[PDB]
């Protein structure tokens, strides 16, 4: 394995280093407003060195944005694809590229048998070429890598089955900035080339100046270069026709032949296109070839890419005719006139890349190496697109919940073949496709119209219910004696209990387990652990009595804690946000021990009084002028006090101190160690009254964030042997700190209400001497070094926080792990901050045509890890990556893939078993089974199961990693006949593995295996 810590890769372009050097000046460059007046040597071209030009027709189709998926399909996309089929069939020289398989699959399954055959034929002959072949063209900022891979796999599996093609060139023209997670996944999925568009206008200029727009994009830690994928960055402001022919959009617009005649479109530069004729073709070709030769100056080969398309183009037969016929007349003239030394024709994306690599192999070009990312994007002036890192945070949190439910449903159902009557495959395909659709760059981004967000939310809710149904059927099968198991595939054997989604303060929908001495004295509950190592996590359930004891199914007692059930309410008289105690339901809390990829059964039993192994939390309400606060049967009276500083410690874990406003102020790691200052604060950003307004995309704050008036908020302290918390009712946020014996859990119930033109930020203030350095993750896969730049505006120093962020000095690190993607920064030494929600009255003029005024309450979750790092082996000061510690990685896993909880639905579970997976290997802590998916239906003679293994890299801190077992996924299921390493989509066998053993992967590497079974 490569060492990803000690050796710094040597690349031509390192984006953090380039950012530190760049001036980011926003100068008027002339017709190319953000570049310069390009010159070329006309003698560059001659009969022996021609420019080869590929004009690549395309249509950008959003699977939800202004319309829903289904509205766009019926009004636009089905007509685009119907006209593509007819025009390409009729015109063999015409070409077209297609990205979004969600739409293509919808279209193809509505075709009659003869039209399916004609479609297969224009794909087989290469006229219609799929690019990327994902379900969508995903967001690259907020998306988890697991869901990027899921949607790629959904689209590519469909294309292999129905079109017998697997794209090797990727096309990503609209996401708002670009991540190196994409070449990471694409290069491990058979790709050879990718194309990107939305990068900072000042990056496009800097790379263009050096002809570094085409580069071998490697990962930031990759010293050897085997991760590298050839990348083409488009040079200009847009992918529309005015910005794709060359640098002068006034000229290029005249070659968008839809902008004349009866289509109702026009050129903003006020020179219309003209029909190409014998009379004008020389004059028109003079201007067009001059644009092409200017664009070709920015690249290193004599092969030029000219996209020809725009949003939902090629909808009408007449548009295909007007574009094709006028371009054919131009090609006929140019190719026939030696003085141009051009060969121009319609082409596809793969044809372009094939021709470039042929030029490279002929010695025309040696391409530069590049590492880094392309965040945060700006398309103009100070208009940085960091708003969408936070917009519609309810759905951003829902994405992470559904990610986990899909993983858990696929894994729990994978252990067996299912009869078709169980409809397992149907439910899992529905859930995979709804989650895949949401990865679209108007889905998870929060940039769609309100009614389209409602469609995404309804789809995801269906997907969650489908996963729940698969999971509970699977648990009943895995834990019922075979002598008894006789399933009804429609029946609910278990209900799922989820404490963190939507959250009881958001939707009070948790099931209360109703126990009674002389009716239902006990209930079985089951925990699932999707991670491939033993886990011992606190779990909670709602129960109808506080007098409840826990056992394992073998009747061994389990230590438990009972806490009241609290909810928070506005008082209209006092404006105070105050807690109310339930007199009817209580929380039972205990430690579940669950095998790797396994199940564990417990029993909850009622008694008439305090049982032997159940303790009761104390509750202190800190508020002047207390009113009484009853808790029904709960045996401990609430205590009252005036606001004051509080300290808590659970187990031998850290001691936390809180302010009289219930906000953290210090962490002490051990009895002996210093009280380390760590302050939580809430601030507000506003919007500019004059000049450019924030909206769903853009973050344009009116200066630094302002302190928020908290008043004298009500603080509730629940102190237990197993779990303690401090909760405070702040304006717009119920803020909780929860302690279970290690890194605290932070929960924010965020309700921005009617606070128009407000962004709520949560900030941490420390004395960590971080300077200008901080670290944020990319897609939950890797941590990238950031440098705060005072030469850029505040909004430019905001980055996506898809799963975590940290600051550190030589001695101390503070990491904040997230259960949802949000925008964040370190705007000063020792600080971290992360946006909670944003409510914007204005549109930001990027096409959505609305602000963000559809906010709803959301429960955000976090872990906060303070650690000493002076004994850790850290990368050198030049390394562009950072790595989590073991504790921070485990804390992230606790947020993203918690234990699943199941409540048995009926009164008696005949044949209940205690455990599943007790002899599953418990793998080393840096290894995950990111995916386990049965790939075959029950009718297949050879069953196939696919696994995606990911090995992260964790900082070595002198703590030797104790006894762990070798995980060979090929031997998890019996009767293995073959084990293959495959592409990550499972579509190509790369290696028939010695001994049917799936080897463990290297740090920072992801591998796919498929086991076949007789
Ligand atoms: C591409 C972009 N023009 C929009 C933002 O400006 C985007 O939200 C939408 O997906 C469109 O296709
Ligand atoms: Zn789009």
Describe this structure in words.
The chain is an alpha+beta fold and about 1000 residues long. The chain has five domains: about 1-380, Glycoside hydrolase 38, N terminal domain (7-stranded beta/alpha barrel, Alpha-Beta Barrel); about 380-490, Glycoside hydrolase family 38, central domain (Substrate Binding Domain Of Dnak, Chain:A, Domain 2, Up-down Bundle), CATH 1.20.1270.50; about 495-615 and about 900-920, Golgi alpha-mannosidase II (Immunoglobulin-like, Sandwich), CATH 2.60.40; about 620-895, Distorted Sandwich (Beta-galactosidase, Chain A, domain 5); about 920-1014, Immunoglobulin-like (Sandwich). About 20% of the residues lie in helices and about 30% in strands. The chain has 15 helices and 49 strands. The relative contact order is 0.11. Homodimer; disulfide-linked. Catalyzes the first committed step in the biosynthesis of complex N-glycans. It controls conversion of high mannose to complex N-glycans; the final hydrolytic step in the N-glycan maturation pathway. One of its GO terms (cellular component) is Golgi membrane. It is a single-pass type II membrane protein.
Please render the helix and strand layout as text.
Elements: E1 13-14, H1 15-21, E2 51-60, H2 69-90, E3 96-98, H3 101-110, H4 113-124, E4 128-130, H5 145-163, E5 169-172, H6 181-187, E6 193-196, H7 201-209, E7 214-217, E8 229-233, H8 249-252, H9 281-296, E9 303-311, H10 317-336, E10 342-346, H11 349-361, E11 369-371, H12 393-414, H13 424-438, H14 450-478, E12 494-497, E13 512-513, E14 522-529, E15 535-543, E16 548-552, E17 557-558, E18 560-570, E19 577-594, E20 598-606, E21 614-616, E22 618-622, E23 639-641, E24 646-649, E25 655-658, E26 664-668, E27 676-685, E28 706-707, E29 715-719, E30 724-730, E31 733-739, E32 745-750, E33 758-766, E34 773-778, E35 782-787, E36 799-801, E37 804-808, E38 812-818, E39 822-825, E40 831-839, E41 858-868, E42 881-882, H15 886-896, E43 900-904, E44 915-916, E45 927-934, E46 943-951, E47 976-982, E48 989-992, E49 1006-1013
Parallel strand pairs: 1-11, 2-9, 2-10, 3-4, 5-6, 6-8, 7-11, 13-15, 18-21, 22-23
Antiparallel strand pairs: 7-8, 12-43, 14-20, 14-43, 15-19, 16-17, 16-20, 18-19, 20-44, 22-29, 24-25, 25-26, 26-27, 27-28, 27-33, 29-30, 30-31, 31-32, 32-41, 33-40, 34-35, 34-37, 35-42, 36-39, 37-38, 38-41, 39-40, 45-46, 46-49, 47-48, 47-49
The site of the ligand *[C@@H]1[C@@H](N)[C@H](CO)[C@@H](O)[C@H](O)[C@@H]1O has 10 residues, from loops.
């Amino acid at each position: 394995c490569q060492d990803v810590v000690q050796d710094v890769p040597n690349v031509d372009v390192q984006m953090l280093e380039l950012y530190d050097r760049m001036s980011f000046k926003d100068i008027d460059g002339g017709v190319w407003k953000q570049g310069w007046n390009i010159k070329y040597d006309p003698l560059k071209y001659n009969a022996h060195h021609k420019l080869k030009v590929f004009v690549v027709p395309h249509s950008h189709n959003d699977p939800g944005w202004i319309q829903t998926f289904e509205e766009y399909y019926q009004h636009d996309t089905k007509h685009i694809l119907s006209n593509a089929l007819r025009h390409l069939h009729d015109n063999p020289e015409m070409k077209f590229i297609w990205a979004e398989i969600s739409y293509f699959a919808r279209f193809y399954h509505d075709l009659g048998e003869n039209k399916k055959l004609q479609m297969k034929s224009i794909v087989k002959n290469g006229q219609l070429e799929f690019v990327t072949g994902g379900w969508v063209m995903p967001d690259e900022a907020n998306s988890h890598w697991r869901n990027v891979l899921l949607q790629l796999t959904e689209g590519q599996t469909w294309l292999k089955q129905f079109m017998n093609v697997t794209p090797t060139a990727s096309w990503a023209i609209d996401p708002f900035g670009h991540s190196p997670t994409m070449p990471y996944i694409l290069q491990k999925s058979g790709f050879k080339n990718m194309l990107i568009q939305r990068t900072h206008y000042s990056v496009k200029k800097e790379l263009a100046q050096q002809r570094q727009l085409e580069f071998l994009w490697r990962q930031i830690w990759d010293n050897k270069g085997d991760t590298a994928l050839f990348t083409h960055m488009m040079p200009f402001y847009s992918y529309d026709i005015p910005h794709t022919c060359g640098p002068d959009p006034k000229v290029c617009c005249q070659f968008d032949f839809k902008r004349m005649g009866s289509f109702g479109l026009s050129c903003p530069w006020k020179v219309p296109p003209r029909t190409i004729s014998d009379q004008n073709v020389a004059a028109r070709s003079d201007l067009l070839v001059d644009q092409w030769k200017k664009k070709a100056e920015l690249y290193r080969t004599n092969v030029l890419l000219i996209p020809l398309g725009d949003d939902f183009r090629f909808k009408q037969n007449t548009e295909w005719d007007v574009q094709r016929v006028n371009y054919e007349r131009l090609f006929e003239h140019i190719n026939s006139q030696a003085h141009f030394n051009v060969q121009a024709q319609f082409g596809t994306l793969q044809e372009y890349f094939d021709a470039v690599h042929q030029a490279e192999r002929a010695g025309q070009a040696e391409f530069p190496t590049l590492s880094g990312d392309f965040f945060t994007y700006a398309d103009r002036s100070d208009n940085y697109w960091s708003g969408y890192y936070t917009s519609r945070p309810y759905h951003k949190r829902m994405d992470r919940v559904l990610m986990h439910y899909v993983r858990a449903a696929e894994m729990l159902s994978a252990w067996h073949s299912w009869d078709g009557m169980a409809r397992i495959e149907e439910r899992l395909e529905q859930a995979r496709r709804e989650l895949s659709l949401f990865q679209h760059h108007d889905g998870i981004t929060g940039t769609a119209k309100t009614h389209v967000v409602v469609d995404y939310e309804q789809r995801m809710q269906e997907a969650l219910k489908a996963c729940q149904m698969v999971m509970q059927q699977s648990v009943y099968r895995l834990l019922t004696k075979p002598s008894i198991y006789s399933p009804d595939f429609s029946f609910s054997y278990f209900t799922l209990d989820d404490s963190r989604w939507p959250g009881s303060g958001v939707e009070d929908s948790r099931t209360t387990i109703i126990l009674g001495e002389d009716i239902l004295p006990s209930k079985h509950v089951v925990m699932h652990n999707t991670l491939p190592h033993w886990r011992e996590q606190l779990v909670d359930f709602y129960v109808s009595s506080p007098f409840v004891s826990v056992t394992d199914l073998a009747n061994n007692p389990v230590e438990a804690q009972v806490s009241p059930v609290w909810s928070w309410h506005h008082d209209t008289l006092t404006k105070t946000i105050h807690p109310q105690g339930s007199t009817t339901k209580y929380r039972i809390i205990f430690k579940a021990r669950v095998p790797p990829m396994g199940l564990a059964t417990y029993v909850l039993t009622i008694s008439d009084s305090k049982p032997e192994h159940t303790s009761y939390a104390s509750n202190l309400l800190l508020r002047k002028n207390p009113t009484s606060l009853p808790l029904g049967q709960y045996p401990e009276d609430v205590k009252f006090g005036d606001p004051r500083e509080i300290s808590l410690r659970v187990g031998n874990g850290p001691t936390l101190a809180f302010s009289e406003q219930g906000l953290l102020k210090s962490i002490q790691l051990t009895q002996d160690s210093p009280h380390v200052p760590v302050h939580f604060k809430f601030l507000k950003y506003g919007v500019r009254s004059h000049g450019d307004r924030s909206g769903a995309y853009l973050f344009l704050p009116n200066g630094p964030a302002s302190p928020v008036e908290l008043g004298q908020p009500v603080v509730l302290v629940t102190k237990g042997k197993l779990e303690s918390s401090v909760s405070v009712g702040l304006p717009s946020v119920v803020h909780q700190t929860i302690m279970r014996g290690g890194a605290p859990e932070i929960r924010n119930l965020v309700d921005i209400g009617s606070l128009d033109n407000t962004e709520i930020v949560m900030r941490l203030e420390t004395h960590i001497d971080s300077g200008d350095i901080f670290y944020t993750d990319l897609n939950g896969l890797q941590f990238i070094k950031r440098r705060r730049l005072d030469k850029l505006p505040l909004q430019a120093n905001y980055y996506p926080i898809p799963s975590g962020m940290f600051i550190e000095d030589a001695n101390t690190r503070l990491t904040l792990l997230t259960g949802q993607p949000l925008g964040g920064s370190s705007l000063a030494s020792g600080e971290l901050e992360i946006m909670q929600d944003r409510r914007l009255a204005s549109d930001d003029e990027r096409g959505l045509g609305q602000g963000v005024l559809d906010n709803k309450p959301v429960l955000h979750i976090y872990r906060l890890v303070l650690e000493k790092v002076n004994n850790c082996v850290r990368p050198s000061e030049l390394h562009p990556a950072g790595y989590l510690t073991s504790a921070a990685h485990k804390a992230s896993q606790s947020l993203l893939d918690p234990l699943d909880k199941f409540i048995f639905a009926e009164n008696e579970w005949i044949g209940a078993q205690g455990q599943f997976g007790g002899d599953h290997p418990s793998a080393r802590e840096d290894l995950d089974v990111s995916v386990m998916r049965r790939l075959t239906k029950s009718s297949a003679k050879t069953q196939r199961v696919g696994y995606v293994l990911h090995r992260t890299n964790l900082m070595q801190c002198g703590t030797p990693e104790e006894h762990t077992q070798k995980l060979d996924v090929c031997h998890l299921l019996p009767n293995v006949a073959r084990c293959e390493r495959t592409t990550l989509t499972f579509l190509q066998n790369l290696e028939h593995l010695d001994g049917m053993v799936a080897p463990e992967v290297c740090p920072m590497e992801t591998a796919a295996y498929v086991s076949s079974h007789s």
